[PDB]
Design a protein around this ligand. Sequence first.
Ligand code: F3S
Length: 310
Amino acid sequence: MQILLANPRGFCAGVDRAISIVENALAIYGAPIYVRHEVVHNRYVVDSLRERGAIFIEQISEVPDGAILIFSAHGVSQAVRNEAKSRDLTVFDATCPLVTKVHMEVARASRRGEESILIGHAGHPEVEGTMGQYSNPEGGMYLVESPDDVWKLTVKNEEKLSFMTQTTLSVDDTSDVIDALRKRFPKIVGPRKDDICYATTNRQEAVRALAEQAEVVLVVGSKNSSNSNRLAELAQRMGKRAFLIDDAKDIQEEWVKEVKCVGVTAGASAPDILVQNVVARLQQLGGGEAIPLEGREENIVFEVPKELRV
Ligand code: F3S
């Protein structure tokens, strides 16, 4: 049984930075370091930081005066950001720069009183944070998940309209939404394509390459990780058996079956130890040596703020 590894896979530049922000704050200030919601959507990473002294909280309310507070990679709304400002807290922001980039566009639209439409998934923290950059009653900020949502939408002035996207969306699905948007609203302004990040685009291209080769695809990642669910869905959609798994324990022999070729990838918040565990398990189920697939170069690094360098 052949074992293929997708490339690129696993940590993105934003996840690397967010984790180093927490790890360095712990090294500099000692435990506890308070983090608002999971720093990234991976339970292995979150468990490991919590063991080292990070306390993951829900509400700024729960953080005592004088503490160190960290915002997650997904970003926060202005309301949350202003609440922390009003408190006696030291805050470091681990929001990925490629999310902040979207936040800045939503803010510009807001000051102009022009309506904006965000393509994303309701309930996701990144969406709460991006929608929460808009604050002008004369304009409006609307969320759209699907092409139908686009045809349902009523807008005050379709001559002054723009859109933005969540970073971790299906590129193909998002294209379908954007098509509807530009047909339904011909004067809508946007990016050339979308706000889907390099890491998502690349990971979905790598899993498509993987899935054309493999009968079964295991994607390493947690259930609340949007980008990891998009990986599994992409492979599933090409008619392959895909499974989102947190670790090697989750692998069921029935999946490995009489499969001639199994592929493994990882979402942007999953550590590579976990894919190595998965390979070790697959080899004990008759897998051979792991063959890495060739991939697009990634060369982007985002640095920790200077106060947190170690
Ligand atoms: S928006 Fe940023 S945090 Fe990772 S998944 Fe994309 S590089």
